[PDB]
Structures are given as structure tokens and as C-alpha cells.
Nucleic acid binder design. Structure first.
Lengths: 48, 52, 47, 158, 459, 48
DNA sequence: GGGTATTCGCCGTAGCCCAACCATATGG
DNA sequence: CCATATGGTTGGGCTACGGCGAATACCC
């Protein structure tokens, strides 16, 4: 949404914003034909 | 390398050779009977180029 | 040809050390025990 | 060295140590018989091209030895200074170019000790110095003299 | 639900009204979708801003033009003497050797395919003049192209000067030619009452006819245009053409000019056409102070160029803050040309001192007293302009000084390009070889060349 | 974590999916790695 | 000043932007 | 009727820890 603060120029504009890889039905990731996998990370939680 | 050989023998630092080698300060090679503005000139003493 | 190998003389690795040392423009006094500078090339590439 | 010995007779142990270090240097130059005037460089060597092999890969690209393009930079520096001295230029350009030539020597000997490592433009890994050819694991000592591959060998399981 | 003649964003569609949310304010807007759904909902208060509604053809053609020689122009031992006596001046023996060499190629029936880097000296139209009087020696016409109207003017001037008492009909046709006289010249070269036609893009655009298209003088074709080269090829139905393109195409055809096009340049610049003191450098304003001090010591004139979109004027105001002494203008174009010639006569009157020009086209004169030149964006340029600047600074025997300002050293191809600019002293083929190196860097097939050349013979 | 997907068997793929880790950009290093990042706390019981 | 740890530091560990040129639009 | 302003066409060119150390103040 182009919303000019002083003008009020209202231009709605959808934009193409990249090609997002999709997790497959089993859950994998074909990347460049090849198959990736992501191992989930643990770390210390935030807080006090 | 630490120390610098020029800074070893001619008793200076990397900044001083930075000034004389890469042209930021003059160093006097002959005092020529001059004066370093009240204090006299003495060989191996740094000096800015405009003041030179 | 079916013989034993020859025996390598002054090392060519050590030669390329001498070459890069002179590329840093340094003297190496490679010598015998009696101070003969044995040019390992024996005059191959030395004037 | 006499007054350095006088400082050795002077009780200031700190200045004793400093004059002692400088005395070690000057004593080493004395027994060495070296001329300390040789520490200023004029006669730049030339590396033989088998030692700096710019041999070409299949796809046009090369075994780009970084010191060769550094040598090119130095040649342009030298000839720029030569033509600048050959015309009676104003001194500021002369001084700037002499300084830049000094930078060229400084980066060629070892890039990135004074200032940043000037890489190839369009790249950020540096130009592998002659010291880098010498020093380091991939440097001459550790790489080329301590670990290698071998012909007439085999490998299987037991 | 209505179309719109919308001024400032093209096609508009009034699709009703939109009462939309300014953050607290319900202003009214118009439902407007544009070209590619330009979904602007402008405030309705701006009511007046809205009203309610490939080359292989020419390759095989020029290959056949290679495969078909055509007519010869025999040497005509009165026609070239008739013009040749009229030149009261020495010619370069290199250029004279090239002159009678390409005249011998005119005597060949083959299509004359010559390039010569004859740039500045003892009349550089002179070879074209005597070749043209051979061409009209058989009455054939002389097409003459040009990069710009001013050079066309100057060359047709020199043709008129050469042909005062010689009936070789020259005529200029471009933008500045009056329209009745434009089609008069079009009809006349169409009638053969004109022998030499002169001008820029209009000649390629204006529908021309040739009684006998004998000569086609092209010159510095890189700025004339590569598609304009193809329009020349359209106007090249098997004719014989002259190329003084000293500054050539950037090796999209210039390496192909090696081999088939006759590379007949002249060398040996006049020792007395001496170089200018080149100083490639970074920028520093104190060196500028020194240089302009030298130029006011000689009382000369100053060249400094600005090519960036940034304000020529506030830059000039910064200069005047540094240098309140001189009097500087702004020769950014997009101006009425009265201002242009007024600046010309202001640097003739010379109380104006620093020519803040902005193009080598805007530096298209060599003022004699302009004996310094200051360039800061030569990285973002091209070499022909560079030594045209070099050829536009300094009168002879006045040792001018070229100052070139480049603090960024981060454009390695352009860096060594400026290096191989500033190494060159003067026109000792560094024109040629510097262009050679440049276009080697610029672009960087005989198999399909002679292959389809054979089937062109089969045609 | 952009790891090569392994498919030596279905169990290999499954265990590779169910693998979890403690390293990564923002994980830890092997240099200062002690035993607290190596031993098993009592709170891992029935948990890991 | 001679000597004391000290305390923390350093080193090591892929975008226009104009330049000619042309026709297109317009008020005295 | 001409002019000056519009814009269109290429042209051509480029963009956080550890060991030692080094000031760091400090005892008599």
C-alpha cells in the first residue's frame, strides 16, 4: 500500500517477492534437484 | 616485525617512518646551523612539511 | 631399461628455497665446510 | 656502541636493556659484516616463471599466481613514476606516486600488514603474498617439505 | 465505470469513488486502475489532473556485395588535377600515399572498402575532395555522412571553398536545412543537379534518390550509430563507400574490419602538435588552485567537466567558494542555444575564465588559450571522447597540462583503461593501438563466414 | 543446518528428520566445549 | 629509581544517465 | 508560418576466549 502521508496518494500494489521453497508432502526439500534436510536446533531459551 | 630495525638503530617508531617514508613529516639530515623555532635544529628530528 | 635408480644430488626443493631466498634478495652462503659456494646448478643459470 | 656501553654503565636498567638490544643489533651487523645500507631496496629481483607458473586451465582460466599481477601493478607503478619524473611534474603528484609505489612494494612483500589486504578487485580473498608462499601451513615449509602424496602406493581394507 | 484521459500516469479508468482512511480522516478517492493495474486512488481534490476519455539478411547481402565487384572509376587525369591544383597547401606524404592508394582502389571495379585515420592537419577532406572529383569526374554522386550538423556545415563549407570555380554541386540536408530547400536538394540529387549531399540522420531518414551513387563518405561511425550503420547498409544497394571512421565500432564489427576492410591509417603526428602534460591523479582542490593559478599566470582558459546528474551550479558555487577570483559559467545543455553562443563569446571576451563544460560535444571547439583541462569522471567515459578532449585542449607551442582526478581506484578494467589512455603521448598510432586494446577488452566466426559466403555465390 | 538429505533406508531418512542438534550459527563451538554440553541432565529423562 | 604482579589487550583461534540525432506540439 | 518545447531513436559509457605481554599502577 503506497500511502503518502501528506498527499494521501493511495496506490495498492502487489509485488512478486521471491520463490519460496516448499516443504514436500513427506517433509523434505528438493533443492537444485538435490534433496536437503534440516536438523532442528536447540539452544538456551531467552529470559532472565 | 617488532622491533623495527630503523626504529631500533635510528630510534623511532612505525608512525615516524610512516611519516618520512610515506611523506608526512620531514626529518633533518643536516642541521645547517638553522633553528627549530627557538630550540635549535638537531639531526634525526621530525618536522612537518609546511613548517619545513 | 631395467637398472637400479640413480641417486639424487643437491635437492631441487632446496634449490627452489635458494631461488625464493634470492627473490627476497638475500644472501645464502651455502657452502662446504671449507667455504666453497657450491652453485648447485654448477653454472646452469648463473652468469 | 661506546655510549651504549656507557648506558650499560648507567644504572638505568630499563635503558640498559634498550641500549643492550640495540647493541645486540649493531654487534650482529658488525660481526656479520653486512652493510646496513642494504636495507633500502633498489634492485628488485625477478622471479623465474616456472616458480610463478601462469599455466592455463581448459576453460580459458589459469593458474593465476597472484604475485604476477602484483608484478604488473609494480611495473605500472615504476613506469608511471618514470614518465612522471620524465616530464617535470608538480611535486605533489610525484610524492603521491612515490608513496603509492611504496605501497605497491609493501603489498607485494606482504599484503595487509600496512593497511588492508588489497585483493583482486571483484574479490575479497587477498592476493597470496610471497610470504604466504613461504609462511603458513600451505607455505613452503610445512606444505612442500613435510606432507605430500605419493606415487607407487595403494590402499585397501584389511 | 468510465475510461480516462489521465495526464501523468497514462491510461486511467474511473471506477467510482473511494472513501478511504487517512489515519483518522476519511478523504474521498477515485477507484482508478491503470496500465498493468495501476491501482491509484488519488485524492479527488486533484480533479484537474484528470480528463474523461534479424541481421543475416544484411550479412548475406553484404557477402554478395563482396561477391560482386561492380564498376571502376578510372583515374581521370584531368578531374583529379582540376581539384588538385586548387589546394594551395602541402599534404602529408603518408596521407598522399593513402590518397592515391584509395584512388587506385577506385580504379578497381571492386567495392571500395577503405578506412583512414586522417584526423587533424592539412585539410582532411582533401582525399575525399579529390576522390569526389574523380567520382563526379564520371558525374557520379557523393553521399557524405557525418556525426553532427556542425561538422557537416564545416565540411560542406570546405567543399564549397574547394569548389568555388569548380562545378561540383555540394548541398547540405539535415535538421537546419530549410524544408522547401530540403526537398529541393532531395529532388536535385534525385535529378542529378546535385553531386554532393551533406548531413546527419535526416539523410538516412529523408527519402533520397541517386542519379549515380558513386561515393558515400562516412566518418567516425561509432557515434553515428551501429543501427545507423545498418541504415547505411539499407542505403548501400551495391555501391562504393568512403569511411573516415578513425574512431570505429567497438569490435562488434571492427575485428571483422581486419581482413576484408582495408586498414590504411596514417601515422607520424606533426612534431609541433606536441602533447599536453597529462596528470592522472585523485582529486584535491589545492592542485586545482595551483593549476588555475598557472592558467591565470598565462591568462589562459580552464576546462573542467561535470557529467554527474548532480547540480552543475551548486558545484560551481562550491568552486567559487574556493575560487572567488575567476568567472565560471555552466554549459550543461538542455538550454536555448543563445546561451551557448553567449558563453562562447564570453570565453572569447575572456572575462569568463573557467569553461565549466559538460560534454566533448559541448567542448566541440579548441579554444587556443584553453591550456588546462580537469576531468574527474573519466572512469565513466569512453576513449574517443578522451583524446578528443586531448585534441580540444591547448593551442600549439603552449605546453598545456592535463589533470585527471580519480580518487576511487576500484574499477580495474577502467583503471588500466585510463592507464593506457595517459601513457600515450600523441597521435603516433596510439589512436589505432589504443582502440585495439580497448575493443579487445570491450567484446572479449570465420567458420560460418566463408561457409555462407559460398552459398551466397550459389545465389 | 542446510544438510544433505540421507536416504540409505527409510529409517535413515526418518532418523535424519528426527535428529536434533545443539550447534549452528548461534549454537556453540568445539573449542570451549566442556561436558555440560556433553553430559545428560536428569531432566532429559523421557525427554531426549 | 628497582622491582611487582596486573589487568586487560592483542594476537591467535546488476543499474540508469546522459550524448547526438529524428519527428510532434505549440504562440507570437 | 515559424519557434520553442515534447518526446522518440539509438550510442556509448558506466554502476568471544586464553597465553603472553604490555602498559600500570604500584611496594622501599
Amino acid at each position: 500500500q503506497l500511502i503518502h502521508k501528506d498527499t494521501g496518494l493511495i496506490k495498492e500494489d502487489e509485488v512478486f517477492l521471491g520463490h519460496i521453497p516448499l516443504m514436500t508432502e513427506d517433509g523434505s526439500f528438493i533443492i537444485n534437484g538435490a534433496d536437503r534436510v534440516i536438523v532442528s536446533q536447540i539452544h538456551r531459551s531467552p529470559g532472565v | 616485525d617488532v622491533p623495527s630495525k630503523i626504529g631500533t638503530l635510528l630510534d623511532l617508531s612505525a608512525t615516524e617512518l610512516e611519516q618520512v617514508l610515506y611523506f608526512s613529516k620531514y626529518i633533518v639530515l643536516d642541521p645547517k646551523g638553522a633553528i627549530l623555532n627557538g630550540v635549535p635544529v638537531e639531526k634525526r628530528q621530525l618536522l612537518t612539511d609546511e613548517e619545513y | 631399461k631395467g637398472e637400479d635408480v640413480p641417486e639424487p644430488s643437491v635437492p631441487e626443493s632446496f634449490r627452489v628455497l635458494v631461488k625464493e631466498l634470492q627473490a627476497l634478495a638475500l644472501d645464502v652462503q651455502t657452502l662446504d665446510e671449507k667455504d666453497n659456494p657450491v652453485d648447485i646448478f654448477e653454472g646452469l643459470a648463473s652468469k | 656502541e661506546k655510549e651504549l656501553l656507557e648506558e650499560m654503565k648507567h644504572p638505568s636498567r630499563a635503558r640498559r636493556a634498550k641500549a643492550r638490544k640495540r647493541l645486540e643489533v649493531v654487534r650482529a651487523f658488525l660481526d656479520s659484516g653486512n652493510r646496513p645500507e642494504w636495507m633500502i631496496l633498489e634492485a628488485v629481483p625477478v622471479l623465474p616463471p616456472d616458480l610463478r607458473p601462469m599455466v592455463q586451465v581448459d576453460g580459458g582460466r589459469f593458474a593465476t599466481s597472484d604475485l604476477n599481477d602484483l608484478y604488473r601493478r609494480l611495473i605500472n607503478r615504476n613506469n608511471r613514476l618514470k614518465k612522471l619524473l620524465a616530464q617535470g611534474a608538480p611535486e605533489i603528484i610525484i610524492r603521491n606516486e612515490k608513496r603509492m609505489l611504496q605501497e605497491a612494494v609493501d603489498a607485494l612483500l606482504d599484503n595487509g600488514r600496512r593497511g588492508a589486504p588489497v585483493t583482486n578487485p571483484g574479490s575479497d580473498r587477498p592476493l597470496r603474498s610471497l610470504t604466504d608462499i613461504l609462511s603458513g601451513k600451505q607455505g613452503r615449509f610445512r606444505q612442500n617439505l613435510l606432507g605430500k602424496r605419493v606415487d607407487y602406493s595403494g590402499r585397501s581394507v584389511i | 465505470g468510465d475510461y480516462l484521459i489521465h495526464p501523468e500516469h497514462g491510461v486511467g479508468q474511473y471506477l467510482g469513488l473511494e472513501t478511504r482512511e487517512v489515519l483518522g480522516v476519511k478523504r474521498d478517492y477515485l477507484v482508478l486502475r491503470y496500465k498493468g493495474e495501476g491501482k491509484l486512488y488519488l485524492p479527488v481534490e486533484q480533479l484537474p489532473l484528470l480528463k474523461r476519455h534479424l541481421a543475416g539478411r544484411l550479412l548475406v547481402l553484404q557477402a554478395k556485395r563482396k561477391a560482386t565487384p561492380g564498376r571502376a572509376f578510372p583515374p581521370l587525369p584531368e578531374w583529379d588535377p582540376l581539384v588538385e591544383k586548387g589546394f594551395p597547401y602541402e599534404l602529408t606524404p603518408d596521407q598522399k600515399r593513402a590518397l592515391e592508394e584509395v584512388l587506385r582502389d577506385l580504379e578497381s571495379p571492386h567495392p571500395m572498402d577503405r578506412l583512414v585515420s586522417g584526423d587533424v592537419g592539412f585539410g582532411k577532406t582533401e582525399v575525399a575532395l579529390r576522390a569526389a572529383h574523380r567520382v563526379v569526374g564520371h558525374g557520379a554522386q557523393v553521399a557524405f555522412l557525418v556525426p553532427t550538423t556542425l561538422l557537416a556545415e564545416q565540411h560542406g563549407k570546405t567543399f564549397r571553398e574547394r569548389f568555388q570555380g569548380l562545378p561540383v554541386r555540394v548541398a547540405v540536408l539535415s535538421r537546419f536545412t530549410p524544408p522547401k530547400e530540403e526537398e529541393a536538394i532531395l529532388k536535385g540529387l534525385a535529378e542529378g543537379t546535385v553531386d554532393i549531399v551533406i548531413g546527419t540522420h535526416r539523410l538516412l531518414q529523408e527519402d533520397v534518390r541517386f542519379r549515380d551513387l558513386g561515393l558515400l563518405i562516412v566518418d567516425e561511425e561509432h557515434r553515428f550509430g551501429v543501427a545507423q550503420k545498418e541504415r547505411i547498409r539499407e542505403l548501400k544497394a551495391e555501391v562504393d563507400t568512403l569511411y573516415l571512421s578513425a574512431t570505429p565500432i567497438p569490435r562488434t564489427l571492427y575485428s571483422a574490419l581486419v581482413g576484408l576492410k582495408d586498414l590504411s591509417s596514417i601515422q607520424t603526428p606533426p612534431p609541433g602538435r606536441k602533447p599536453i602534460k597529462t596528470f592522472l591523479a585523485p582529486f584535491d582542490p589545492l592542485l586545482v588552485r595551483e593549476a588555475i593559478l598557472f592558467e591565470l599566470e598565462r591568462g589562459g582558459k580552464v576546462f573542467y567537466v561535470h557529467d554527474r546528474v548532480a547540480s552543475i551550479e551548486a558545484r560551481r558555487r562550491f568552486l567559487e567558494s574556493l575560487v572567488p577570483e575567476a568567472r565560471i559559467g555552466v554549459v550543461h545543455g538542455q538550454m536555448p542555444e543563445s546561451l551557448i553562443e553567449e558563453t562562447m563569446l564570453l570565453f572569447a571576451e575572456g572575462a569568463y575564465d573557467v569553461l565549466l563544460a559538460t560534454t566533448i560535444i559541448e567542448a566541440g571547439l579548441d579554444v587556443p588559450e584553453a591550456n588546462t583541462i580537469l576531468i574527474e569522471r573519466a572512469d565513466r567515459l569512453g576513449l574517443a571522447t578522451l583524446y578528443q578532449l586531448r585534441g580540444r585542449v591547448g593551442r600549439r607551442e603552449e605546453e598545456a597540462y592535463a589533470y585527471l582526478f580519480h580518487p576511487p581506484r576500484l574499477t580495474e578494467a577502467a583503471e588500466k583503461r585510463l592507464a593506457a589512455i595517459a601513457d600515450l603521448s600523441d597521435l603516433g598510432s596510439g589512436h589505432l593501438l589504443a582502440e585495439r586494446d580497448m575493443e579487445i577488452r570491450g567484446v572479449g566466426s570465420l567458420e560460418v563466414y566463408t561457409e555462407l559466403l559460398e552459398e551466397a555465390i550459389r545465389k | 543446518l542446510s544438510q544433505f538429505k540421507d536416504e540409505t533406508n527409510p529409517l535413515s531418512s526418518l532418523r535424519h528428520k528426527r535428529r536434533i542438534s545443539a550447534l549452528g550459527p548461534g549454537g556453540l563451538t568445539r573449542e570451549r566445549a566442556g561436558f555440560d554440553v556433553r553430559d545428560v541432565h536428569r531432566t532429559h529423562y523421557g525427554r531426549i
